[PDB]
Amino acid sequence: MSGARCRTLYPFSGERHGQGLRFAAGELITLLQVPDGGWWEGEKEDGLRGWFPASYVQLL
């Protein structure tokens, strides 16, 4: 465990402009940043990256 993993509940959206990073529901995503009470960048096997709040993910 190099970085902390988290399971997405239900990834909701609204501002879809450019290559916005879409997670799947129930998906196992590791964070790429660790600010205490901040935004975390999710990694995907898809190969893209983007920062989202803890609201859409659940720390494992």
Side-chain angles (χ1 to χ4, degrees):
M1 183 177 296
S2 303
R5 55 175 179 170
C6 61
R7 180 186 181 206
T8 56
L9 301 78
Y10 290 101
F12 304 114
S13 54
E15 182 179 86
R16 301 179 182 158
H17 187 74
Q19 54 168 91
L21 178 69
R22 304 176 303 150
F23 301 121
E27 185 58 74
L28 301 183
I29 300 297
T30 303
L31 44 68
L32 299 178
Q33 206 187 93
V34 291
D36 58 290
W39 313 88
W40 301 317
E41 298 78 85
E43 59 169 77
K44 288 189 59 190
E45 306 300 286
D46 174 81
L48 295 184
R49 177 187 177 197
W51 50 277
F52 288 88
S55 309
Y56 299 105
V57 299
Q58 181 183 148
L59 294 176
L60 301 177

Short mmCIF file of all heavy atoms in Angstrom, two decimals:
data_model
loop_
_atom_site.label_atom_id
_atom_site.label_comp_id
_atom_site.label_asym_id
_atom_site.label_seq_id
_atom_site.Cartn_x
_atom_site.Cartn_y
_atom_site.Cartn_z
N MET A 1 0.86 -1.21 0.00
CA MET A 1 0.00 0.00 0.00
C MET A 1 0.89 1.25 0.00
O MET A 1 1.31 1.73 1.06
CB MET A 1 -0.97 -0.03 1.22
CG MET A 1 -1.98 1.13 1.28
SD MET A 1 -3.14 0.98 2.66
CE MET A 1 -4.04 -0.51 2.22
N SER A 2 1.21 1.75 -1.21
CA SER A 2 2.08 2.93 -1.41
C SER A 2 1.29 4.22 -1.08
O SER A 2 1.82 5.14 -0.45
CB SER A 2 2.62 2.96 -2.86
OG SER A 2 3.33 1.76 -3.15
N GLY A 3 0.02 4.24 -1.51
CA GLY A 3 -0.91 5.34 -1.24
C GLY A 3 -2.23 4.81 -0.70
O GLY A 3 -2.52 3.62 -0.83
N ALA A 4 -3.05 5.71 -0.12
CA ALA A 4 -4.33 5.35 0.50
C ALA A 4 -5.40 5.11 -0.59
O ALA A 4 -5.60 5.95 -1.47
CB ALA A 4 -4.79 6.43 1.49
N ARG A 5 -6.05 3.94 -0.52
CA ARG A 5 -7.17 3.57 -1.41
C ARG A 5 -8.50 4.08 -0.83
O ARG A 5 -8.62 4.32 0.38
CB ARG A 5 -7.21 2.02 -1.59
CG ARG A 5 -7.30 1.23 -0.27
CD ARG A 5 -7.45 -0.29 -0.47
NE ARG A 5 -7.52 -1.00 0.83
CZ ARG A 5 -7.84 -2.29 0.99
NH1 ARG A 5 -8.19 -3.04 -0.04
NH2 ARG A 5 -7.81 -2.81 2.20
N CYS A 6 -9.49 4.23 -1.71
CA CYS A 6 -10.84 4.69 -1.37
C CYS A 6 -11.83 4.11 -2.38
O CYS A 6 -11.49 3.92 -3.54
CB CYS A 6 -10.90 6.24 -1.36
SG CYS A 6 -10.54 7.02 -2.95
N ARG A 7 -13.05 3.82 -1.92
CA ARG A 7 -14.12 3.29 -2.76
C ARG A 7 -15.14 4.40 -3.01
O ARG A 7 -15.67 4.98 -2.07
CB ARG A 7 -14.81 2.10 -2.04
CG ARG A 7 -15.96 1.43 -2.84
CD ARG A 7 -16.70 0.36 -2.02
NE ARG A 7 -17.78 -0.30 -2.78
CZ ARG A 7 -18.86 -0.89 -2.24
NH1 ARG A 7 -19.06 -0.89 -0.92
NH2 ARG A 7 -19.75 -1.47 -3.03
N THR A 8 -15.42 4.65 -4.29
CA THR A 8 -16.41 5.65 -4.71
C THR A 8 -17.82 5.13 -4.41
O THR A 8 -18.08 3.94 -4.58
CB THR A 8 -16.25 5.93 -6.24
OG1 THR A 8 -16.36 4.69 -6.94
CG2 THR A 8 -14.89 6.59 -6.58
N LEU A 9 -18.72 6.01 -3.94
CA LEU A 9 -20.11 5.63 -3.67
C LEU A 9 -20.91 5.76 -4.98
O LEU A 9 -21.21 4.76 -5.63
CB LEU A 9 -20.74 6.51 -2.55
CG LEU A 9 -20.05 6.48 -1.15
CD1 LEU A 9 -18.77 7.35 -1.11
CD2 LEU A 9 -21.05 6.89 -0.03
N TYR A 10 -21.18 7.02 -5.36
CA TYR A 10 -21.91 7.38 -6.59
C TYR A 10 -21.30 8.69 -7.13
O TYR A 10 -21.56 9.76 -6.57
CB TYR A 10 -23.43 7.54 -6.32
CG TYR A 10 -24.18 6.23 -6.01
CD1 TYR A 10 -24.51 5.86 -4.70
CD2 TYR A 10 -24.55 5.36 -7.04
CE1 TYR A 10 -25.18 4.68 -4.44
CE2 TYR A 10 -25.22 4.18 -6.78
CZ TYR A 10 -25.53 3.85 -5.48
OH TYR A 10 -26.21 2.67 -5.21
N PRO A 11 -20.41 8.61 -8.17
CA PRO A 11 -19.77 9.80 -8.79
C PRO A 11 -20.78 10.65 -9.60
O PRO A 11 -21.16 10.28 -10.71
CB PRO A 11 -18.67 9.17 -9.71
CG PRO A 11 -18.54 7.76 -9.23
CD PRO A 11 -19.92 7.36 -8.81
N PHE A 12 -21.24 11.76 -9.00
CA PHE A 12 -22.14 12.73 -9.66
C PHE A 12 -21.31 13.84 -10.33
O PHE A 12 -20.14 14.06 -9.98
CB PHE A 12 -23.14 13.33 -8.64
CG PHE A 12 -23.97 12.28 -7.90
CD1 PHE A 12 -23.83 12.09 -6.52
CD2 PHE A 12 -24.90 11.50 -8.58
CE1 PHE A 12 -24.58 11.14 -5.86
CE2 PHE A 12 -25.64 10.54 -7.91
CZ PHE A 12 -25.49 10.38 -6.55
N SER A 13 -21.95 14.56 -11.26
CA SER A 13 -21.29 15.58 -12.10
C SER A 13 -22.30 16.65 -12.54
O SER A 13 -23.50 16.57 -12.22
CB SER A 13 -20.63 14.89 -13.32
OG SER A 13 -21.56 14.09 -14.04
N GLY A 14 -21.80 17.67 -13.25
CA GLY A 14 -22.63 18.76 -13.78
C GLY A 14 -21.83 19.65 -14.71
O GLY A 14 -22.25 19.93 -15.84
N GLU A 15 -20.65 20.11 -14.24
CA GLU A 15 -19.71 20.87 -15.08
C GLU A 15 -18.82 19.88 -15.85
O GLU A 15 -17.75 19.47 -15.38
CB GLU A 15 -18.85 21.85 -14.23
CG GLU A 15 -17.90 22.71 -15.09
CD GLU A 15 -17.06 23.71 -14.27
OE1 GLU A 15 -15.99 23.33 -13.76
OE2 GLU A 15 -17.47 24.88 -14.13
N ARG A 16 -19.33 19.45 -17.01
CA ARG A 16 -18.59 18.59 -17.94
C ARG A 16 -18.04 19.47 -19.07
O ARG A 16 -18.79 19.87 -19.97
CB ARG A 16 -19.50 17.47 -18.50
CG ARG A 16 -20.12 16.54 -17.43
CD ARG A 16 -21.03 15.46 -18.05
NE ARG A 16 -21.65 14.61 -17.01
CZ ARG A 16 -22.77 13.89 -17.18
NH1 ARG A 16 -23.46 13.94 -18.31
NH2 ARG A 16 -23.21 13.15 -16.18
N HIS A 17 -16.75 19.82 -18.97
CA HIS A 17 -16.05 20.63 -19.97
C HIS A 17 -14.61 20.11 -20.10
O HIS A 17 -13.88 20.04 -19.11
CB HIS A 17 -16.07 22.13 -19.56
CG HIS A 17 -15.51 23.06 -20.62
ND1 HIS A 17 -16.23 23.35 -21.75
CD2 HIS A 17 -14.32 23.70 -20.68
CE1 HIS A 17 -15.47 24.16 -22.47
NE2 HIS A 17 -14.30 24.40 -21.86
N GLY A 18 -14.23 19.74 -21.34
CA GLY A 18 -12.93 19.12 -21.60
C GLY A 18 -12.89 17.65 -21.16
O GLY A 18 -13.91 16.95 -21.24
N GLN A 19 -11.72 17.20 -20.69
CA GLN A 19 -11.49 15.81 -20.26
C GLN A 19 -11.69 15.65 -18.73
O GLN A 19 -10.77 15.26 -18.00
CB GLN A 19 -10.07 15.33 -20.72
CG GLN A 19 -8.90 16.24 -20.28
CD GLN A 19 -7.55 15.58 -20.49
OE1 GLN A 19 -6.93 15.73 -21.54
NE2 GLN A 19 -7.10 14.82 -19.51
N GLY A 20 -12.92 15.95 -18.27
CA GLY A 20 -13.31 15.72 -16.87
C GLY A 20 -13.25 14.24 -16.50
O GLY A 20 -13.74 13.40 -17.28
N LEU A 21 -12.70 13.91 -15.32
CA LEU A 21 -12.37 12.52 -14.94
C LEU A 21 -13.61 11.85 -14.32
O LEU A 21 -14.08 12.25 -13.26
CB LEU A 21 -11.19 12.50 -13.92
CG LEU A 21 -10.76 11.09 -13.40
CD1 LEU A 21 -10.10 10.25 -14.51
CD2 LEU A 21 -9.84 11.19 -12.16
N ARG A 22 -14.13 10.83 -15.02
CA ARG A 22 -15.35 10.11 -14.61
C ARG A 22 -14.98 8.80 -13.92
O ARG A 22 -14.37 7.92 -14.54
CB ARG A 22 -16.23 9.83 -15.86
CG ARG A 22 -16.59 11.10 -16.66
CD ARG A 22 -17.38 10.78 -17.95
NE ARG A 22 -16.66 9.84 -18.84
CZ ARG A 22 -17.24 8.96 -19.67
NH1 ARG A 22 -18.56 8.84 -19.74
NH2 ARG A 22 -16.48 8.18 -20.43
N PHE A 23 -15.33 8.69 -12.64
CA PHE A 23 -15.20 7.44 -11.87
C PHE A 23 -16.46 6.57 -12.09
O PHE A 23 -17.52 7.09 -12.45
CB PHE A 23 -15.03 7.73 -10.36
CG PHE A 23 -13.82 8.58 -9.98
CD1 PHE A 23 -13.98 9.79 -9.30
CD2 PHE A 23 -12.53 8.15 -10.28
CE1 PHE A 23 -12.88 10.54 -8.93
CE2 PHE A 23 -11.43 8.90 -9.91
CZ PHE A 23 -11.61 10.10 -9.24
N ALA A 24 -16.32 5.25 -11.87
CA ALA A 24 -17.47 4.33 -11.80
C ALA A 24 -17.95 4.25 -10.34
O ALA A 24 -17.18 4.54 -9.43
CB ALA A 24 -17.07 2.93 -12.33
N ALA A 25 -19.23 3.91 -10.13
CA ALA A 25 -19.79 3.67 -8.77
C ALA A 25 -19.25 2.35 -8.20
O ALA A 25 -19.21 1.33 -8.90
CB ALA A 25 -21.32 3.66 -8.82
N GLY A 26 -18.81 2.38 -6.92
CA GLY A 26 -18.23 1.20 -6.24
C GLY A 26 -16.78 0.92 -6.63
O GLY A 26 -16.20 -0.08 -6.19
N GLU A 27 -16.19 1.83 -7.42
CA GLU A 27 -14.84 1.67 -8.01
C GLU A 27 -13.74 1.92 -6.96
O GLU A 27 -13.85 2.84 -6.14
CB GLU A 27 -14.69 2.63 -9.22
CG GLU A 27 -13.39 2.51 -10.03
CD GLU A 27 -13.15 1.11 -10.60
OE1 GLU A 27 -13.82 0.74 -11.58
OE2 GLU A 27 -12.30 0.37 -10.07
N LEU A 28 -12.67 1.11 -7.02
CA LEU A 28 -11.53 1.20 -6.10
C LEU A 28 -10.47 2.13 -6.70
O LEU A 28 -9.78 1.77 -7.66
CB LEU A 28 -10.95 -0.22 -5.82
CG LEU A 28 -11.95 -1.25 -5.19
CD1 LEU A 28 -11.26 -2.59 -4.88
CD2 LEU A 28 -12.66 -0.66 -3.94
N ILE A 29 -10.39 3.35 -6.15
CA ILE A 29 -9.49 4.43 -6.62
C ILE A 29 -8.50 4.80 -5.50
O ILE A 29 -8.91 5.00 -4.36
CB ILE A 29 -10.35 5.70 -7.02
CG1 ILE A 29 -11.36 5.36 -8.17
CG2 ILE A 29 -9.45 6.90 -7.39
CD1 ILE A 29 -10.71 4.93 -9.48
N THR A 30 -7.20 4.87 -5.82
CA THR A 30 -6.17 5.38 -4.90
C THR A 30 -6.01 6.91 -5.11
O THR A 30 -6.04 7.38 -6.25
CB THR A 30 -4.81 4.64 -5.12
OG1 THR A 30 -5.01 3.23 -4.95
CG2 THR A 30 -3.70 5.13 -4.18
N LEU A 31 -5.87 7.67 -4.00
CA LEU A 31 -5.59 9.12 -4.07
C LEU A 31 -4.12 9.38 -4.44
O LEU A 31 -3.24 8.55 -4.16
CB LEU A 31 -6.04 9.84 -2.74
CG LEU A 31 -5.67 9.17 -1.37
CD1 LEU A 31 -4.16 9.16 -1.08
CD2 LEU A 31 -6.46 9.81 -0.19
N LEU A 32 -3.86 10.52 -5.10
CA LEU A 32 -2.52 10.92 -5.56
C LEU A 32 -1.98 12.10 -4.73
O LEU A 32 -0.84 12.55 -4.95
CB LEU A 32 -2.57 11.30 -7.07
CG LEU A 32 -3.03 10.15 -8.04
CD1 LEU A 32 -3.11 10.64 -9.50
CD2 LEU A 32 -2.12 8.92 -7.89
N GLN A 33 -2.80 12.59 -3.79
CA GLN A 33 -2.45 13.70 -2.89
C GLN A 33 -3.06 13.41 -1.52
O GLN A 33 -4.09 12.72 -1.44
CB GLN A 33 -2.97 15.05 -3.48
CG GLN A 33 -2.18 16.29 -3.02
CD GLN A 33 -2.81 17.60 -3.48
OE1 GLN A 33 -3.59 18.22 -2.75
NE2 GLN A 33 -2.52 18.02 -4.70
N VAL A 34 -2.45 13.93 -0.43
CA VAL A 34 -2.92 13.70 0.96
C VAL A 34 -3.00 15.02 1.80
O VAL A 34 -2.38 15.11 2.87
CB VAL A 34 -2.01 12.61 1.69
CG1 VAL A 34 -2.22 11.19 1.10
CG2 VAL A 34 -0.51 13.01 1.65
N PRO A 35 -3.75 16.09 1.36
CA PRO A 35 -4.02 17.27 2.22
C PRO A 35 -5.11 16.93 3.25
O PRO A 35 -6.20 16.43 2.88
CB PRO A 35 -4.46 18.36 1.21
CG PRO A 35 -5.12 17.59 0.10
CD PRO A 35 -4.38 16.27 0.02
N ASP A 36 -4.81 17.15 4.54
CA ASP A 36 -5.75 16.91 5.65
C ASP A 36 -6.98 17.82 5.50
O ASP A 36 -6.92 19.04 5.74
CB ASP A 36 -5.02 17.09 7.02
CG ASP A 36 -4.38 18.47 7.23
OD1 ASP A 36 -3.38 18.78 6.55
OD2 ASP A 36 -4.86 19.26 8.07
N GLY A 37 -8.09 17.23 5.02
CA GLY A 37 -9.31 17.97 4.72
C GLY A 37 -9.17 18.82 3.46
O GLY A 37 -9.42 20.03 3.48
N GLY A 38 -8.78 18.16 2.36
CA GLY A 38 -8.62 18.82 1.06
C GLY A 38 -9.05 17.94 -0.11
O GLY A 38 -9.61 16.85 0.10
N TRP A 39 -8.78 18.42 -1.34
CA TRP A 39 -9.15 17.71 -2.58
C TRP A 39 -8.08 16.63 -2.86
O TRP A 39 -6.89 16.86 -2.64
CB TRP A 39 -9.23 18.69 -3.78
CG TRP A 39 -10.01 19.96 -3.51
CD1 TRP A 39 -9.51 21.13 -2.99
CD2 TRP A 39 -11.40 20.21 -3.76
NE1 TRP A 39 -10.50 22.07 -2.90
CE2 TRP A 39 -11.67 21.53 -3.36
CE3 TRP A 39 -12.44 19.44 -4.27
CZ2 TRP A 39 -12.93 22.09 -3.46
CZ3 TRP A 39 -13.70 20.00 -4.37
CH2 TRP A 39 -13.94 21.32 -3.97
N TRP A 40 -8.53 15.46 -3.33
CA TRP A 40 -7.64 14.33 -3.68
C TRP A 40 -7.77 14.03 -5.17
O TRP A 40 -8.89 13.99 -5.69
CB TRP A 40 -7.99 13.07 -2.85
CG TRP A 40 -7.91 13.26 -1.35
CD1 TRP A 40 -6.93 13.91 -0.66
CD2 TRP A 40 -8.82 12.76 -0.36
NE1 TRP A 40 -7.18 13.88 0.68
CE2 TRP A 40 -8.34 13.18 0.90
CE3 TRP A 40 -10.00 12.03 -0.41
CZ2 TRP A 40 -8.99 12.88 2.09
CZ3 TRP A 40 -10.65 11.72 0.77
CH2 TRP A 40 -10.15 12.15 2.01
N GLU A 41 -6.64 13.80 -5.86
CA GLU A 41 -6.65 13.41 -7.27
C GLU A 41 -6.77 11.89 -7.36
O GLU A 41 -5.98 11.17 -6.77
CB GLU A 41 -5.38 13.86 -8.05
CG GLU A 41 -5.14 15.38 -8.15
CD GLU A 41 -4.55 15.98 -6.87
OE1 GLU A 41 -3.32 15.95 -6.72
OE2 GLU A 41 -5.31 16.50 -6.02
N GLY A 42 -7.80 11.43 -8.07
CA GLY A 42 -7.99 10.02 -8.29
C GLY A 42 -7.20 9.53 -9.49
O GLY A 42 -7.05 10.26 -10.48
N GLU A 43 -6.66 8.31 -9.38
CA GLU A 43 -5.99 7.62 -10.50
C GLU A 43 -6.94 6.57 -11.08
O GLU A 43 -7.71 5.96 -10.34
CB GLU A 43 -4.67 6.93 -10.04
CG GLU A 43 -4.86 5.87 -8.94
CD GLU A 43 -3.61 5.03 -8.70
OE1 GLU A 43 -2.66 5.53 -8.06
OE2 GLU A 43 -3.55 3.87 -9.17
N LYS A 44 -6.89 6.40 -12.39
CA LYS A 44 -7.63 5.35 -13.10
C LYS A 44 -6.70 4.57 -14.03
O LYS A 44 -5.71 5.13 -14.53
CB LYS A 44 -8.82 5.94 -13.89
CG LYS A 44 -10.01 6.42 -13.03
CD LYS A 44 -11.25 6.78 -13.89
CE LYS A 44 -11.75 5.59 -14.72
NZ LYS A 44 -12.78 5.98 -15.71
N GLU A 45 -7.04 3.30 -14.27
CA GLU A 45 -6.37 2.44 -15.27
C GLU A 45 -6.64 2.97 -16.70
O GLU A 45 -5.90 2.67 -17.64
CB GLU A 45 -6.87 0.97 -15.12
CG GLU A 45 -6.74 0.38 -13.70
CD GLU A 45 -5.30 0.34 -13.17
OE1 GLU A 45 -4.52 -0.51 -13.64
OE2 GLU A 45 -4.94 1.17 -12.31
N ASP A 46 -7.74 3.75 -16.82
CA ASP A 46 -8.09 4.54 -18.02
C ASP A 46 -6.90 5.43 -18.46
O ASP A 46 -6.67 5.62 -19.67
CB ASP A 46 -9.33 5.41 -17.67
CG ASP A 46 -9.73 6.40 -18.77
OD1 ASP A 46 -10.41 5.99 -19.74
OD2 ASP A 46 -9.38 7.60 -18.67
N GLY A 47 -6.16 5.97 -17.47
CA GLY A 47 -4.93 6.71 -17.72
C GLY A 47 -5.05 8.21 -17.48
O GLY A 47 -4.05 8.92 -17.58
N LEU A 48 -6.27 8.71 -17.17
CA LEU A 48 -6.49 10.13 -16.82
C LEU A 48 -6.40 10.37 -15.30
O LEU A 48 -6.32 9.42 -14.50
CB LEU A 48 -7.84 10.65 -17.39
CG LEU A 48 -7.98 10.70 -18.95
CD1 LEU A 48 -9.33 11.32 -19.37
CD2 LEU A 48 -6.78 11.42 -19.62
N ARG A 49 -6.43 11.66 -14.94
CA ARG A 49 -6.25 12.17 -13.57
C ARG A 49 -7.15 13.41 -13.37
O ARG A 49 -7.41 14.15 -14.33
CB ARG A 49 -4.76 12.54 -13.33
CG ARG A 49 -4.44 13.17 -11.95
CD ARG A 49 -2.99 13.67 -11.83
NE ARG A 49 -2.74 14.32 -10.53
CZ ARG A 49 -1.71 15.12 -10.24
NH1 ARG A 49 -0.77 15.37 -11.15
NH2 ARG A 49 -1.61 15.67 -9.04
N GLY A 50 -7.64 13.60 -12.13
CA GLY A 50 -8.43 14.78 -11.76
C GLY A 50 -8.74 14.80 -10.28
O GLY A 50 -8.86 13.74 -9.65
N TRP A 51 -8.92 16.01 -9.73
CA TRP A 51 -9.12 16.24 -8.28
C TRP A 51 -10.61 16.37 -7.97
O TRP A 51 -11.34 17.11 -8.64
CB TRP A 51 -8.32 17.49 -7.79
CG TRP A 51 -8.51 18.74 -8.63
CD1 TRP A 51 -7.86 19.06 -9.79
CD2 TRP A 51 -9.41 19.83 -8.37
NE1 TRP A 51 -8.30 20.27 -10.26
CE2 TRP A 51 -9.25 20.76 -9.41
CE3 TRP A 51 -10.33 20.11 -7.35
CZ2 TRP A 51 -9.98 21.95 -9.47
CZ3 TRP A 51 -11.06 21.28 -7.41
CH2 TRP A 51 -10.88 22.19 -8.46
N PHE A 52 -11.06 15.61 -6.97
CA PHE A 52 -12.47 15.55 -6.52
C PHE A 52 -12.50 15.53 -4.97
O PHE A 52 -11.52 15.09 -4.35
CB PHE A 52 -13.19 14.30 -7.12
CG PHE A 52 -13.48 14.42 -8.61
CD1 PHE A 52 -12.55 14.02 -9.57
CD2 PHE A 52 -14.68 14.98 -9.06
CE1 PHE A 52 -12.80 14.18 -10.91
CE2 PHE A 52 -14.93 15.14 -10.41
CZ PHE A 52 -13.99 14.74 -11.34
N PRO A 53 -13.62 16.01 -4.33
CA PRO A 53 -13.75 16.02 -2.85
C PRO A 53 -14.02 14.61 -2.27
O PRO A 53 -14.35 13.67 -3.01
CB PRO A 53 -14.95 16.98 -2.62
CG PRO A 53 -15.80 16.81 -3.84
CD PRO A 53 -14.84 16.58 -4.99
N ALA A 54 -13.90 14.52 -0.94
CA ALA A 54 -14.15 13.28 -0.17
C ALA A 54 -15.64 12.87 -0.20
O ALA A 54 -15.98 11.75 0.15
CB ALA A 54 -13.67 13.47 1.28
N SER A 55 -16.50 13.81 -0.61
CA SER A 55 -17.96 13.63 -0.72
C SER A 55 -18.35 12.42 -1.61
O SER A 55 -19.33 11.73 -1.34
CB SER A 55 -18.58 14.93 -1.28
OG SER A 55 -18.14 16.07 -0.55
N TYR A 56 -17.55 12.17 -2.68
CA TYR A 56 -17.85 11.12 -3.68
C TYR A 56 -17.10 9.81 -3.41
O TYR A 56 -17.39 8.78 -4.04
CB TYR A 56 -17.52 11.65 -5.10
CG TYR A 56 -18.36 12.88 -5.50
CD1 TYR A 56 -17.80 14.16 -5.51
CD2 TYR A 56 -19.71 12.75 -5.84
CE1 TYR A 56 -18.57 15.27 -5.85
CE2 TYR A 56 -20.46 13.85 -6.18
CZ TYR A 56 -19.89 15.10 -6.19
OH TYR A 56 -20.66 16.20 -6.52
N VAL A 57 -16.12 9.84 -2.47
CA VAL A 57 -15.28 8.67 -2.14
C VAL A 57 -15.39 8.32 -0.64
O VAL A 57 -15.84 9.13 0.18
CB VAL A 57 -13.76 8.89 -2.53
CG1 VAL A 57 -13.60 9.11 -4.06
CG2 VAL A 57 -13.12 10.06 -1.73
N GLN A 58 -15.00 7.09 -0.29
CA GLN A 58 -15.02 6.57 1.08
C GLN A 58 -13.66 5.92 1.38
O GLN A 58 -13.31 4.93 0.74
CB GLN A 58 -16.15 5.52 1.22
CG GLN A 58 -16.32 4.91 2.62
CD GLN A 58 -17.40 3.83 2.72
OE1 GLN A 58 -17.29 2.88 3.50
NE2 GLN A 58 -18.48 3.96 1.95
N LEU A 59 -12.91 6.49 2.34
CA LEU A 59 -11.57 5.99 2.72
C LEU A 59 -11.63 4.53 3.18
O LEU A 59 -12.51 4.15 3.96
CB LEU A 59 -10.96 6.89 3.82
CG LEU A 59 -10.63 8.37 3.41
CD1 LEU A 59 -10.13 9.18 4.63
CD2 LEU A 59 -9.62 8.41 2.23
N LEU A 60 -10.72 3.71 2.65
CA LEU A 60 -10.61 2.28 2.98
C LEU A 60 -9.38 2.07 3.88
O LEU A 60 -9.54 1.71 5.07
CB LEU A 60 -10.50 1.44 1.67
CG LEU A 60 -11.68 1.57 0.66
CD1 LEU A 60 -11.43 0.74 -0.62
CD2 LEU A 60 -13.04 1.21 1.32
#
